DNA sequence: GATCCCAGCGCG
DNA sequence: CAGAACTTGGGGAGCC
DNA sequence: GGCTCCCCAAGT
DNA sequence: TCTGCGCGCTGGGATC
């Protein structure tokens, strides 16, 4: 009572509170759908309460959070739950305003995660409820297929695709993908709320195995157990996909009672796998799927001018089949466009606007709807357009979307860092200098040894020295202008100016009860992206600090550990790495292989186009001398005699025929302007034919090692000037 | 103290509170710029407080609002203001935590409106403060022009354009339009906060004339005085624009002290005029400028599939120079796409999604970002694409944007109504039936008399009877199924089902202290868009209701008054109308004139294209017979002899030359595929040439009255089937 | 020695 | 993702 | 007989 | 227009 979002039932806390089944719904769309279904089901015994998204993990959080969490307190009040109270008897159950709890949400993985979090919360706080079938879920269809009047509902993508791949005609039906609850109309809620048999599963507790499964899924202690469990699941899925064995979808016709064991080990695990795919990047290009979609859309659009972040995000959502949320796209844009100190070393997207500074580490950026960006010319250098003809593209809803992974010239993952936070894994890879990497890979090309490389950050004046394997020390710049004055001119990585100031200066300037005052005053001269602290203190205290160490006193040093080199290899698998050299070698091997493939593809395409140009030259020369006559000629006879004259059909188009497989057409010669009959056009066409004839041999006489050199040479050719322009303005 | 958004000065309520100048800035962007300038100006004497948008009009509101208004209470606490306290002495001034108040906002009209509202507040509550120069404004430049190193700042559009039209080369400078405060970077705030002399004006009180001006601007009593004041200003502006006399911008070099009189009568009046343009629609097409921009962008895009509302709104903002706000575009889309009962009779944009129902009158619509729409085929019928060649298009920032006003076949304003709330005027025009209007205009075309017409609403089962000039009665449908049971099957216009139910049934079902219970029970059977109330009551009470009148008792009748027919005529002037017939006659006259113009334009274009086709036929016929030879021929000599042979250059392009004014080119007779030398293409070209030769005469033998007939015939031809499809599904 | 809290990012 | 004030004028219903 | 409050829409 | 919680893992700094 008194909670604004309470669409409670009539019998709330009444005589029949054991029959009042509150519906838990994440989202206002789900709340509206429940309200629409209330007309069918009535408001006497059903109450509606929305959720805020994802809930706190009580087993993983502190008691202070539990007390201070609004949503847990609200649900406890509404159900009538009591702290530490045991509910293993019906007399205590009568104290609750509601009898049963029903959960319903999207059919995607995040909904399963929400069910899992609710299960964990209930089991941790009041496990005995599970013994009485306290929880049920309202499933909703995810796919609807239409044929005339017949409508088929599919609750699982696997069974839906099984049905789809067993139809005489896919076009005989229209398929609608219900990837949410806002898509469903209020009218469909009538059908949803008219069928409890098809839309109600009950969480039937089995035994201690369910408790063990929940603990495995949610106890922070069993992280490594989660790692091995996910690895076993991944291996099983790999075996299934390499053997073609279909899996057993849980949403069966007779499926009405579900154990927590199957829910945890069958669908929440699918969410864990999806989260791992979302978060942990790929070794091949260092792009999480969201970033890959962003870049694929930016390439397809090929925008030549400024575009608003929201507009580009909407374009990404529409032409790349992104189905998670637009604000995530806005965050991805603002992350990939950041270029200040400690952020991305290479800014693929130009930050035309307030994208954040060292003051807050990108948390002070302007709103993402008044900031523009455009493709920096560097990115196209990293991913040559010609290379795209080899990438294995994907299909979502029978639409052409992003490839599995892009292919750059330089290993992108070890350039701009990687901060991925999966489930059962993680990834924290620092930055490196681009020129050092390109020199190392050029040396590797020549057969020399790869020089060991140390992490570096763009325009980072501080020095980093390795103190051990995957163990480095980051240190700022401290100077002593005069005997009782010091200057800070550099800060460690991930040490924002505002946070460092507020956490260091005044906590130590005036001090606390535990630590007295140290310094007297400080003056800051902060430029756009540089820190200049001038601190004056008592002479003796600065002498003590020098005795104690200037870096040690001011906390201008920090430890960086990189014991979590976990990436996705070329063949789509999770792999933990040890040092940079292994990743560099793997990238080198794959890049050589794709140079082999692209040389073959380029030589084939160039041969086909040279053949086409030679045919065009032959035909125009025949026309000039009058050997060919088409004036007032029938199309069929003309085509027949051209075939008999020794002309081949569409070599360029015929070239694409060999690509996809693994009457005759002469439009290309015939779709030519009459200007071609002028001598200047003839000379120009002959010139182009000869140029292509030279160029095909020039390329076929090269080697894959040769072509990489100009890739790096061109990449570095204008890398300096833009970086010079990055400093010439400043 | 304790207000979260307070960046107060150090001396807040201290010894020198008379020197603490709080800054009032609407927008978090303006707050951020103020914070950036705080570094230059120091936080000792300056405090920062942001606005919430637009503030309450204290002179026009009740005391309950004043007590319950968060903005006013917060600002009163921050300044230390006291109710009913007089501040006409320095001793009372020292009770205030702040000495001066500075106002800073955008340079557009809304900023002037915010200054006006603040002035009204201060004058109404504590006028004596104005006698002591209590208020000052911080102006910011609106246009920045760049040339190499020189930068010029312009604070007023008039002076900026005066400078612009007096330059040897506009491209010698780059112009940036600072149409906001988020555009300005923090670095520019340094320059802004370094120059008070150029960015500080003080509100110097003059006398009772200032008080009279404020009262005129803000007192609800002087609405008519505002009407005549605005009319006089409009007449003066018309005289100036017809005589070319420039106006005197107050943003002068020596301008440092400003009187409230000038502020009211030279800028805030401009905001009133702009609001009038925004709100009061146009006579010709009933589109406010926002709706016109939406339709212009929708036509240019010519989207053939569903598009998200947010995506289309962003497209509007970028390709139509809209510079107000995206949420306004979302509201405009959701308004123009609405099609339920009582809403738009004609839905130009198909509402593909939950756009709202009769339950809440469009206030229950889904999220503006989860809903799609696309151009209904009907709209293109109203605005034929060929007609667009006559509209006078506009230019913003030297970019091609929407025209002044579109020409439809039917008068659009009297079709979907008009609900505009301007300043000093208003407009409320109800709906009408399309078929009735088209029949009336067809009769007007034949010289007959225009039948008087009554307002009608699409699918509105209720009946409307006129009770006087601009005075109508709207009545629902109530029946008596049995002697003690009634059924309501229709509600008056603008009477939403939920609002009517909550305001009628339960205030009368159970009654109040003043009125006891009347009915016993009610059951509703509400379909998608129909109301079905079945009410059972005591027999004697229903007998009394029949004695008192069934419509009267249930409030199923309402009065509609249309004494505010105020529109914008073709010449862009405000005009108050009396009845529908005058508007119809004006639209009829302008539409006949534009048919005359379009007939002339079409005959000219058709003649030019027929000439071009005849030239192409002559050339190809010459080529077939060999009279013309171009094989291996020089371009220059070929062009010369073609000129001498009697061929003219680009008649279609030459046709456009005459349009814009109020060497020879032969690509069109040369840019054809070699298929043109085949006999089939020759026969086809002859067929088109002859068809155009027939068609030009067929059109030139018609009359403007004729061409309208098929416009209406085609419009009605498929008007029924879509309306039939609107009901066939239901 | 040991526990606790927080900052990094694509998501609900 | 969602929910939150005000403007500006006409006119209609509902209280005293 | 009269004052008061609210709904309508493109904007802060 | 803005502003508000939680996730999931690693590891580092502070506090006891
Ligand atoms: C908090 O920060 C600022 C707020 C504002 C106001 C504002 C102010 C409000 C308020 C709401 C609004 C809101 O308008 C609302 O938008 C909604 C957008 O979605 C649709 C569904 O419905 C719209 C509402 O019909 C409209 O009323 C803002 C949108 O555009 C604005 O200009 C509005 O309710 C409380 O007071 C201005 C600023 O600087 C100029 C700010 O910095
Ligand atoms: C109110 O209605 C609902 C809210 C939500 C949550 C949510 C919940 C919150 C909360 C915040 C949020 C918020 O996340 C924030 O997004 C921001 C988007 O712009 C940028 C600038 O910054 C992002 C924040 O980094 C992130 O924290 C929502 C955005 O997308 C969501 O899914 C979020 O703070 C309090 O609790 C889910 C629902 O159903 C699934 C709802 O019905
Ligand atoms: Mg979902
Ligand atoms: Mg503005």
Residue numbers in the entry:
A (entry chain A), B (entry chain B): 457 to 1118, 1140 to 1207
Copy text verbatim from the article accompanying this structure deposition.
Human TOP2 proteins, including the two isomers TOP2A and TOP2B, resolve topological stresses during DNA metabolisms such as replication, transcription, and chromosomal compaction. TOP2 catalyzes both positive and negative supercoiling as well as decatenation. TOP2A and TOP2B share 67% identity at the protein level, which is largely distinctive in the C-terminal domain (CTD). Taken together, this study suggests that activated ERK2 phosphorylates TOP2B to regulate TOP2-DNA interactions and favor transcriptional activation in IEGs.
The resultant EGR1 fragment (EGR1 #3-3, 50 bp, –30 to +20 of the TSS) was used to form TOP2B-EGR1 TSS complex. Although the protein-DNA complex itself was unstable, it could be stabilized by the addition of etoposide, a small chemical inhibitor that traps TOP2 in the TOP2-DNA cleavage complex, which is otherwise a transient intermediate. The cryo-EM structure of the ternary complex was determined at a nominal resolution of 3.9 Å. The structure contained a pseudo-symmetrical dimer of two TOP2B molecules. Although the density of the ATPase domain of TOP2B (1–456 aa) was observed in the 2D and 3D reconstructions, interpretable maps were not obtained in the 3D refinement probably because of its intrinsic flexibility relative to the core domain. Consequently, the flexible CTD (1208–1626 aa) containing ERK-phosphorylated residues was not visible. Therefore, the final model of TOP2B includes the DNA-binding and catalytic core domains (regions of 457–1118 aa and 1140–1207 aa, respectively). We observed a DNA segment docked to the central cleft of the TOP2B dimer. Both of the two DNA strands were cleaved at the active site of each TOP2B, and the DNA is bent by approximately 90°. Two etoposide molecules were intercalated into the two cleavage sites of the double strand of the EGR1 TSS.
